[PDB]
Amino acid sequence: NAIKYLGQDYENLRARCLQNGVLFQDDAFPPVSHSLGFKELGPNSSKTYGIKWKRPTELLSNPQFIVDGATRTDICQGALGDCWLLAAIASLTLNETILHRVVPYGQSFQEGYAGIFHFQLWQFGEWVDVVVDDLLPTKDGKLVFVHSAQGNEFWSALLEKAYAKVNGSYEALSGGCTSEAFEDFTGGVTEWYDLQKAPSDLYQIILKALERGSLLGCSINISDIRDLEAITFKNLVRGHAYSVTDAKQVTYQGQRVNLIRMRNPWGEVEWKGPWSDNSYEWNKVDPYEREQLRVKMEDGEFWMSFRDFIREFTKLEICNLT
Ligand SMILES: *[C@@H](C(=O)OCC)[C@H](O)C(=O)N[C@@H](CCC#N)C(=O)N[C@@H](CCCNC(=N)N)C(=O)N[C@@H](Cc1c[nH]c2ccccc12)C(N)=O
Ligand SMILES: [Ca+2]
Numbered sequence: 001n002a003i004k005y006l007g008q009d010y011e012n013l014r015a016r017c018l019q020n021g022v023l024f025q026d027d028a029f030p031p032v033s034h035s036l037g038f039k040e041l042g043p044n045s046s047k048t049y050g051i052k053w054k055r056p057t058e059l060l061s062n063p064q065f066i067v068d069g070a071t072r073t074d075i076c077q078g079a080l081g082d083c084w085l086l087a088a089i090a091s092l093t094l095n096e097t098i099l100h101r102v103v104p105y106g107q108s109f110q111e112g113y114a115g116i117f118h119f120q121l122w123q124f125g126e127w128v129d130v131v132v133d134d135l136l137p138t139k140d141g142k143l144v145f146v147h148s149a150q151g152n153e154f155w156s157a158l159l160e161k162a163y164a165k166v167n168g169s170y171e172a173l174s175g176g177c178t179s180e181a182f183e184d185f186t187g188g189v190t191e192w193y194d195l196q197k198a199p200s201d202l203y204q205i206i207l208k209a210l211e212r213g214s215l216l217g218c219s220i221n222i223s224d225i226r227d228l229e230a231i232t233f234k235n236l237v238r239g240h241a242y243s244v245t246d247a248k249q250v251t252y253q254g255q256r257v258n259l260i261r262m263r264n265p266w267g268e269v270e271w272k273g274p275w276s277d278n279s280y281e282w283n284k285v286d287p288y289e290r291e292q293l294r295v296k297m298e299d300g301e302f303w304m305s306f307r308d309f310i311r312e313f314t315k316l317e318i319c320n321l322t
């Protein structure tokens with residue numbers, strides 16, 4: 001059983017707000033500018049100025065915590081450089097058991113709702129329960145930071161807020177490493193791989209990691225500053241954490257080709273090379289494999305050949321649990 005961050009007690013807080021006819025306002029991470037940030041998001045800044053804190057129950061008549069499951073399409077990055085965190089959360093959803101440890105069951109905007117939610121994280125060398133109120137940064141009635149592809153779904157916005165809380169502010173989350181969020185959700189062991197010096201069995205390692213629910217992300221180093229744009233000629237984003245979400249093998253003109261699937265935590269903007277959604281390659285696999293694996297949809301998620309992956313990306317991170 002998780003210990004309470006700062007001694008804040010989810011169930012006692014929720015019950016007492018319900019008894020006293022109020023919704024929770026979190027003294028530890030309150031709905032003010034200092035919870036946004038200190039410089040790029042400080043009181044005196046252009047980003048800060050239009051932001052208003054609103055509850056999902058003030059935005060919409062029927063907000064839902066989880067809609068059609070907690071899945072990686074619910075992770076669409078907003079105007080914060082927390083790609084590393086969101087790639088980790090998207091990966092987290094592929095392992096149901098670890099997912100529902102971080103995101104406890106039973107939380108809702110209906111029965112028993114009192115403006116408070118809770119999540120569990122590996123922090124300070126402990127499993128910790130972190131509460132948040134549901135006041136969220138919004139602009140023109142829309143979430144400014146992470147949101148789901150379902151506009152009425154809130155669990156992922158609330159998780160990102162809890163993760164900001166432990167680090168001090170949303171701005172504190174700008175720039176990071178995927179392995180750090182992997183740890184904070186698992187307490188497990190991170191390893192990284194230099195894709196330019198990949199071992200010969202690297203596809204096997206990936207397949208076995210995916211089989212056992214380990215979390216995998218990848219990224220392209222910006223090796224000359226930002227000197228070709230962030231976006232490459234083949235539509236890949238440099239210095240940007242991607243989630244690795246599958247590895248599967250296809251028969252391409254009678255030969256097996258090893259494929260790998262990743263998702264941009266933007267929820268949009270995809271590889272436009274071979275095995276991309278509209279690439280010709282899919283014309284030349286057998287119909288069944290094609291219809292099991294290809295999804296023509298701008299969802300941020302796409303296939304590469306493993307050969308292309310290891311040429312295009314520079315780093316892979318794997319967090320293995322027990
Ligand atoms: C990603 C993002 O939000 O996309 C925007 C839409 C976000 O900018 C991000 O996390 N960037 C990372 C690189 C990509 C990843 N993950 C980043 O800026 N720095 C980390 C580098 C990881 C390895 N990079 C690549 N393979 N490309 C990093 O090490 N960050 C630091 C934290 C830090 C402290 N001060 C600065 C200043 C600039 C950048 C980062 C930092 C860390 N030790 O964790
Ligand atoms: Ca969902």
Ligand SMILES: [Ca+2]
Binds near residue numbers: 270295296297299301
């Ligand atoms: Ca896609």
